[PDB]
Write a protein that binds this ligand. Structure first.
Ligand SMILES: CC(C)Cc1nc(C#N)c(N)o1
Length: 123
């Protein structure tokens, strides 16, 4: 049961998203971009993504693994680099800080999940 629990990642990701929502650096990324108030957003960005959407996808049970959740979170940050590419921008700096924060904390979630998969496959 608890060692190598292949479902433990879900609550760990719920907790990491709570930390992200607390971060002042997440303010621009908490909700979808208003496509009326930024009419050129979709001219640039193919697939919008934001932390409320990630949080709801997880709650609905629509991620099969923490790697699928990580892919959507990384899309938030690649979308930000595409839409706000200037390294002079304070929004660029916020995006980089929050991405480093997410990458640090998701690392062990992924590592542990993959170790658990390997153990159950072996046995
Ligand atoms: C976060 C975007 C949806 C909109 C947006 N406002 C700014 C500013 N200021 C920027 N770099 O990008």
């Amino acid at each position: 049961s608890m060692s190598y629990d292949i479902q433990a990642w879900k609550k760990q990701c719920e907790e990491l998203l709570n930390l992200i929502f607390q971060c002042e650096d997440s303010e621009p990324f908490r909700q979808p971009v208003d496509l009326l108030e930024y009419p050129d957003y979709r001219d640039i960005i193919d697939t919008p993504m934001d932390f409320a959407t990630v949080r709801e996808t997880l709650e609905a049970g629509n991620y099969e693994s923490p790697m699928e959740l990580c892919k959507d979170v990384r899309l938030i940050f690649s979308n930000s680099k595409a839409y706000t590419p200037s390294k002079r921008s304070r929004i660029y700096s916020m995006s980089l800080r929050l991405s480093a924060f997410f990458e640090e904390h998701i690392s062990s979630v992924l590592s542990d999940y993959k170790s658990a998969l390997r153990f159950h496959k072996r046995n």
